[PDB]
RNA sequence: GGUCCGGUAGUUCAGUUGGUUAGAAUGCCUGCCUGUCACGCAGGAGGUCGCGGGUUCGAGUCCCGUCCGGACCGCCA
RNA sequence: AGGAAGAC
RNA sequence: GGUACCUAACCAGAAAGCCACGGCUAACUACGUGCCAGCAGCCGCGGUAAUACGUAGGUGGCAAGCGUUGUCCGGAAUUAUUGGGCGUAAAGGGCUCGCAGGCGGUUUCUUAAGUCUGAUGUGAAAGCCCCCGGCUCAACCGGGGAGGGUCAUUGGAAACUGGGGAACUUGAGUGCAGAAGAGGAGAGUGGAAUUCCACGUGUAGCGGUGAAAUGCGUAGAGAUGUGGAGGAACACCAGUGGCGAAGGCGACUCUCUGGUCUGUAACUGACGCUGAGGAGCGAAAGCGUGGGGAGCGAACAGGAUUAGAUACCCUGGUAGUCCACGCCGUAAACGAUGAGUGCUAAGUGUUAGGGGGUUUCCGCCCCUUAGUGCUGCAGCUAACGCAUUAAGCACUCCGCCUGGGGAGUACGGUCGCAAGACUGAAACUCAAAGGAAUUGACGGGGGCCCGCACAAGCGGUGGAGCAUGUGGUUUAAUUCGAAGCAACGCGAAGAACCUUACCAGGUCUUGACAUCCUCUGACAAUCCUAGAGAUAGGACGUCCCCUUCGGGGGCAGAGUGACAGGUGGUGCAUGGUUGUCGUCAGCUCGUGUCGUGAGAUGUUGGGUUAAGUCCCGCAACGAGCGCAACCCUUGAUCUUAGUUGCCAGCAUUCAGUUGGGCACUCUAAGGUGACUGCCGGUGACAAACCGGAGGAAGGUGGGGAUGACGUCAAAUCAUCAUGCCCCUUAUGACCUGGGCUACACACGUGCUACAAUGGACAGAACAAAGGGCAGCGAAACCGCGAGGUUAAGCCAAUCCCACAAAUCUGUUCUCAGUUCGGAUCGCAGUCUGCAACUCGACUGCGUGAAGCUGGAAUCGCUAGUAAUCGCGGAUCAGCAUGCCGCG
């Protein structure tokens, strides 16, 4: 009884996939293994706040590129992450891996980082309203064309669970050539479990 | 204490008169309508006649003994 | 100026 | 009384509690309890996360005290002179005449009762206050002043209120000249209708309501033309017009009579206003006595309607309504606005006058009163609203209110023939009852508009058999969840055993599931005893890599505690998803105006659209989510791209397979294209609507995807997750068998039919979209059959599923429980699987059931749509009537 997920509605027609390959008659166990890579990358790089990973097959070699938007607390001495990730990933999948990193300039317009920012202030236990206003101000001072933010759950009141919305600019969810970046994040506090949905209208596609 | 009428579906009354084959409402059950109940509308139901004897076209309609009701009389010094 | 219709 | 004080000699040691901590009201956190125990001065708190209950800690107020109770004053402007009100909140007497009472126009003299101001005597002393002194200020004790007086005598002032004398005319009356009136009481007269009676004509119905019926009528009704009787009320004139103090007063004439208004200036000269008690009127209904009684008509009766209907509706109909004489004395007796007087912008009608400008002509204008309206400033109000006919600004007098019930009640009085009228408590109980406005919802309220909503049709549902779900019921369990639309072929896109959670049986304690401590450093499989499960022991039977000989690379096992697991409860502890209203067209914000405020405006109004879609006025101007477009697919063509298609144009063969070539269908990239693009008529020329043309389609071409703010505490703890509960020598685990599929019943959804718009048999057909390597499986052979055999081809525009049926031509049946229909039942099989009894599908037989198109009601359907006919696909070893998709 809600809107259909906009990234899942945009993929295939305007949005290119995050995976660019084919597997025949071994499709199932490649999906199982590369989701094991994606959960392991998420679990060990949640501190480094990856926006997205994207993979490809190189005829029994796999190429991984990871979008993290900062080298600073991520690359270490420069080779530490690539040795500690490439040997570990070789140990897990048993196949030849290659890894590369990419950065996002104007780094406050990426939705997964925005929802992780909101979630991080929720375990930081600053007030949710201050989190919404500060993130709205951060996204407009970075510059954008529209932001809609939602946080639902038990927001400090024990006996009621209600959502809060905060928006600015235009976010049409029904124009197809619109390039909404959408993100859902999950926050665990002593009050309970809180859901964040942020979706950003960055630009236009002709 | 005598006299006269009745004892029928869960309830109230026809069939007691018309010796053959047991009926009408109400109530009960199922379905329909309405969000639900009530109304309302479609179908469905048991009774052998207070208890025992007899006899015939054939005993529920005939009579007797008992029980339960209703009515009348139970007077004269 | 052209039907009676209850209750939660 | 050796008491306070003065000198001293030693000890921080003997000496602090009460209340509160949600808001008022300064001061908060955890644990128990979980509509129980309890708190509470009011709001109210507690039905598993209690800042409101009890603890524990801490804080806050006060302090030798601190709280509760009781009483009084405040805040209470909440009995209001200071200091309230009465249109709608509680509150204007029903209205008049007036006694006592309360107020009084101007001027001029006069007294000093009221008024103001000195003098004297008094209002004792302690008390309050002002200024000083003493006990170690202090509490207190003193010394000197201020008064708590409408106080008594007396002096002074005369403005105002009073007492007196004399003027004045505006307030108020009288006269004189005019005007209007449904003002009242009595007597009389008139016409139209209704009823009743008599007669003439006249046939068969009249009346009545949403249909109806009771009633009246062949003993002559109703209609119709006459003539009498009697009662009531006076059509049009008739007017938000007139008159009256109020109630009220409408036919006309007469007798008597009450007022009102205009003008004058001839008079009297403050005669005035209000009015407690008192007296008098006073709608309708009611009562007593005597009349009258046409119509209407409580009561009452019959007829309906309804579940009942003592009611609305129909037919009758007594008291009453009418007159005279009395009584009662009430109304939403209303302007829900007491009477009187005076000031304060205007506009416009109407009633009765007066005066002026060329008229004694018609009318035209300007003053002018006294009504009677309607708009509308300042001003008032809480808004509505009032506004020279105040609810404005004042002055006098009167009446009345002080929260809602109980109550206009009980008691007690005065009236009354009576019913009742006037006056009118309390005990007790609640924390609200209200007034006016705003936002929604709703209406058997209105106005436009839309949708298979109803209407027009087609085909079904219950009716029969069967399949699959739900409730009930029994069992060892029939695992749970869902419950009107929006649960019930739903989660399940597949239960023989695992699935499986549920039941029975026999078995486990760091367990298969994640990491630390220590070894062996590689573990297992093959056959037995029980074996069905763990287990216990046996035959080879705990068997890698780096290795400065130290040790590591986490796979396998072994013993240990921290442990892990919960498809267990809580969707009303939650995120995450979903349906619904609903593809309905709406939902809001910024800035600014209007409003005391809630709010309003934009977002309403007009014209069209499917739309809050577009445009024109507008205290609005804009913006955002929605709508429409962009996306996908189906609809024609150009270029490129021709194999694993096309065989056109050619030669070849039954396999048209081939030798050769892309123009066509075909697969598909870029496009071309349809967008209000032209004409006419409407529409103020705008936006839009209708009819026309190359066109494949004209007015979003068809369909999909797309589902706003929110509602239903809607559904899911069954993917994951703090919150509690039991375990961890067990609700957690292993397996065997059972159950989820039972069955007197009722329902939801579907399938198959009841047939000759057919059945059976025989022959010719037309070929969409998907799936295929632990597979799809062609040919051929065997088989009265599902199937079996070796098996060519295919990792797919080639090979297989793929043999499409309904369709078209022949014979039969001839209307039947049949050559329909196929369900149950026995026999014999095929396939899958360790295993088809509980509980799979399919085939050959035989058996042939109910059913002859289905009541109340009820469902879907508008340019391939319903209906039929098949075909694939998904979960899966096997199982379709379920679901998805295609023709």
From Swiss-Prot:
Matches recorded under PROSITE patterns: KH_TYPE_2, RIBOSOMAL_S3
Any single biological process term in GO: translation
Claim: Zinc-finger is one of the keywords in the record: no
InterPro entries reported for this sequence: KH_dom, KH_dom-like_a/b, KH_dom_type_2, KH_sf_prok-type, Ribosomal_S3_C_sf, Ribosomal_uS3_bac-typ, Ribosomal_uS3_C, Ribosomal_uS3_CS
UniProt domain KH type-2: residue ranges: 37-105
NCBIfam families in the cross-refs: rpsC_bact
Family to which the UniProt record says this protein belongs: Belongs to the universal ribosomal protein uS3 family.
Quaternary structure annotation from Swiss-Prot or TrEMBL: Part of the 30S ribosomal subunit. Forms a tight complex with proteins S10 and S14.
Function: Binds the lower part of the 30S subunit head. Binds mRNA in the 70S ribosome, positioning it for translation.
Name the UniProt record assigns to this protein: Small ribosomal subunit protein uS3
